[PDB]
Design an enzyme around this catalytic site. Structure first.
Site, PDB file in Angstrom:
ATOM      1  N   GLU A   1       0.860  -1.181   0.000  1.00  0.00           N
ATOM      2  CA  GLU A   1       0.000   0.000   0.000  1.00  0.00           C
ATOM      3  C   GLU A   1       0.897   1.232   0.000  1.00  0.00           C
ATOM      4  O   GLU A   1       0.716   2.150  -0.801  1.00  0.00           O
ATOM      5  CB  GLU A   1      -0.885   0.052   1.251  1.00  0.00           C
ATOM      6  CG  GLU A   1      -1.752  -1.167   1.511  1.00  0.00           C
ATOM      7  CD  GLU A   1      -2.687  -1.498   0.365  1.00  0.00           C
ATOM      8  OE1 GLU A   1      -3.263  -0.567  -0.236  1.00  0.00           O
ATOM      9  OE2 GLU A   1      -2.856  -2.701   0.076  1.00  0.00           O
TER      10      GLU A   1
ATOM     11  N   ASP B   1      -5.728  -4.298  -3.842  1.00  0.00           N
ATOM     12  CA  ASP B   1      -6.005  -2.868  -3.852  1.00  0.00           C
ATOM     13  C   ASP B   1      -4.734  -2.045  -4.050  1.00  0.00           C
ATOM     14  O   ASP B   1      -4.762  -0.985  -4.680  1.00  0.00           O
ATOM     15  CB  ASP B   1      -6.765  -2.444  -2.577  1.00  0.00           C
ATOM     16  CG  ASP B   1      -5.933  -2.550  -1.312  1.00  0.00           C
ATOM     17  OD1 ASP B   1      -5.084  -3.461  -1.204  1.00  0.00           O
ATOM     18  OD2 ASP B   1      -6.156  -1.718  -0.405  1.00  0.00           O
TER      19      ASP B   1
END
Ligand SMILES: [Ca+2]
Ligand SMILES: [Mg+2]
Length: 629
Positions: free
Chosen positions: A55, A230
């Site tokens: 991330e 993600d």
């Protein structure tokens, strides 16, 4: 030539960029890898401040892309990709093609059940349970000429704080590690950190392997990596903007575009059920694409033997709205510069874009907030979906997908991180589905932002849910879900979430012309700049309510199992979180935190999370570009 940007907010981005890249502030390691946070006493998704995630890397890319937009220099952006490929995407040495090339697409992996309590592990492998066929592997090997996967492993021990080193040498940095392995009830405080490359050199008799999986025979030396979809999708999103901004200036980031496109091609593995079972009919083995839900699931993982040749790959049956990225899907399916080399890459992403937007709408509560998600594997064992439970293409609705300690959808952050991507899509294409979602969501959130007289503010922090969405009928569409409700439990001043919210409102306002959204976005940015700035970026004091778990959280260890962490910490039944991480007692903040707990007080901290600082920087840049006057 680039269009003119608002001078005030551009300077704010440039100032933040300088603080983030300032060697004296310590956001990066000596190898150029960003840490999760400057502070080390940190426990959230990662359990140590200097451990990093994919991330963070994707946010690093986004930050450098924006820097290129205002400076005209994109070498920083290309460097973020070089660091990513060198340290977060397993190299030929980390995922030997000798093992990966033995992968069997007709038998991707061996079934193992998931349990609702960590004490039920190790989970027993069962070769008799059905497993579907992998339809994309042949596409990938043919296009790229290798059986290795090109995706980021999600967590990295940057300075080798745990001591596993690289490929079991115990001394090199960075070190590939993993934590979560035992189900929905295994919080960050209940894990047993393990090396991705397990040669049985650390831990117990067979490394850490038999803590999680129970096989017929002796556990082989093996490696295993886990992707965070993600994060990889955000890398694509960031690279698209870098490409657009570079071209507006006669510059090029071609090399990086190629990497992003390849990553997006492999990211398709997240579109499949964990064991390739048919979507909507979990008891049956899939025959190919009938096992694809086409959503960005919680993960896809892979591994194989170290001293013997064999490998496996799994997708994920659990889907959370917070992980979706319609923008990345639009890019990979429509932009010629980002067309995947595989035969079905672009077309699969086209299907995902449509499926994702249906998913968001199905989950939109009566108020406007987006609910959890769905799963194709009830209880993680493909059990029968209880009658009365609403479904999405046969998948049962789940309030808190994947994790329950705490609930994966009780944090407001998922709302903004995900809707921000829908806002980018709406801004670029004016897509009607996106508009409908945003109009209702924005009206909800704009009514939950509270500005105080002293310049401070509050936004939702913890939220809760009641009811469920109506079963999805593709031809009927949104019913309004009158029985699905969101409730704001408490408010806070999370600067990362506030920045993401500002970003989302800016893109939406720019396209819709909604003044309420624009002024709220500007008020948030201004409030944070004027009242929360410090020498390292922005910050505020926050309470760490779960820190008592540092000392009183027992970690489950199977009966009779004993081992040692690299530093000598003994792993055995009865240990607490701190017992297998004794180096934490040497942290500068340790004595302070312990003192608070001893006085029956909630510890407080002033944290500089890398993603939050970058989020704020980017939000300023986005406002500067969309509202130049
Ligand atoms: Ca628990
Ligand atoms: Mg994940």
């Amino acid at each position: 030539a680039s269009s003119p940007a608002n001078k005030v907010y551009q300077d704010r981005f440039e100032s933040m960029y300088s603080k983030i890249k300032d060697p004296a502030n310590g956001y990066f390691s000596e190898q150029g890898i960003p840490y999760h946070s400057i502070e080390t006493l940190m426990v959230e998704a990662p359990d140590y401040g200097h451990v990093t995630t994919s991330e963070a890397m994707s946010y690093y890319m986004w930050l450098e892309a924006m820097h290129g937009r205002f400076s005209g220099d994109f070498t920083g952006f290309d460097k973020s990709w070089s660091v990513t490929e060198q340290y977060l995407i397993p190299t030929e040495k980390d995922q030997p093609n000798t093992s990966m090339s033995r992968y069997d697409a007709n038998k991707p992996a061996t079934y193992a059940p998931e349990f609702q309590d960590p004490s039920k592990y190790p989970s027993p492998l069962d070769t008799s349970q059905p497993v579907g066929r992998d339809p994309i592997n042949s596409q990938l090997t043919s296009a790229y000429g290798t059986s290795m996967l090109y995706g980021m492993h999600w967590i990295l021990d940057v300075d080798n704080w745990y001591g596993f080193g690289a490929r079991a040498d115990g001394t090199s940095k960075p070190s590939y590690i993993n934590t979560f392995q035992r189900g929905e009830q295994e919080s960050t405080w209940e894990t047993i950190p393990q090396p991705c490359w397990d040669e049985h050199k650390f831990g117990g008799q067979y490394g850490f392997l038999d803590l999680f999986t129970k096989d017929t025979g002796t556990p082989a030396k093996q490696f295993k990596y886990t992707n965070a979809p993600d994060a990889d999708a955000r890398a694509v999103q960031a690279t698209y903007w870098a490409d657009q901004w570079a071209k507006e200036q006669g510059k090029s980031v071609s090399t990086s575009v190629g990497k992003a496109t390849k990553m997006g091609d492999y990211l398709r593995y997240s579109f499949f059920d964990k064991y390739f079972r048919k979507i909507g009919q979990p008891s049956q083995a899939g025959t190919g694409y009938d096992a694809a839900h086409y959503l960005l699931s919680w993960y896809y993982a892979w591994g194989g033997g170290i001293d013997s040749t064999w490998s496996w790959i799994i997708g994920s049956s659990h889907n959370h709205f917070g992980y979706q990225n319609p923008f990345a899907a639009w890019v990979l399916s429509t932009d010629a510069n980002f067309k995947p080399k595989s035969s079905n890459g672009a077309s699969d992403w086209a299907k995902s874009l449509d499926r994702q937007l249906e998913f968001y709408q199905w989950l939109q509560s009566a108020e406007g907030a987006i609910a959890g998600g769905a799963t194709n594997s009830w209880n993680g064992r493909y059990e029968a979906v209880p009658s009365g439970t609403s479904t999405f293409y046969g998948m049962g609705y789940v309030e808190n997908p994947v994790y329950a300690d705490p609930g994966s959808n009780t944090w407001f952050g998922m709302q903004v991180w995900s809707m921000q991507r829908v806002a980018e899509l709406y801004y670029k294409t004016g897509d009607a589905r996106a508009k409908k979602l945003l109009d209702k969501w924005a009206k909800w959130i704009n009514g939950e932002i509270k500005f105080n007289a002293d310049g401070t503010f509050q936004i939702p922090s913890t939220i809760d849910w009641e009811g469920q969405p109506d079963t999805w009928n593709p031809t009927q569409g949104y019913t309004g879900n009158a029985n699905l409700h969101v409730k704001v439990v408490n408010y806070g001043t999370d600067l990362g979430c506030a920045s993401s919210l500002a970003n989302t409102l800016t893109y939406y306002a720019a396209k819709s012309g909604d003044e309420t959204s624009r002024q709220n976005a500007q008020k948030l940015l201004d409030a944070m700049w004027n009242n929360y700035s410090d020498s390292k970026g922005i910050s505020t004091v926050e309470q760490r309510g779960d820190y008592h778990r540092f000392l009183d959280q027992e970690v489950f260890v199977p009966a009779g199992w004993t081992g040692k962490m690299p530093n000598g910490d003994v792993i055995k039944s009865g240990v607490k979180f701190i017992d297998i991480r004794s180096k934490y007692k040497q942290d500068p903040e340790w004595q302070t935190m312990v003192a608070a707990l001893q006085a029956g007080q909630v510890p407080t901290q002033r944290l500089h999370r890398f993603w939050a600082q970058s989020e704020f920087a980017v939000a300023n840049g986005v406002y500067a570009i969309l509202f130049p006057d």
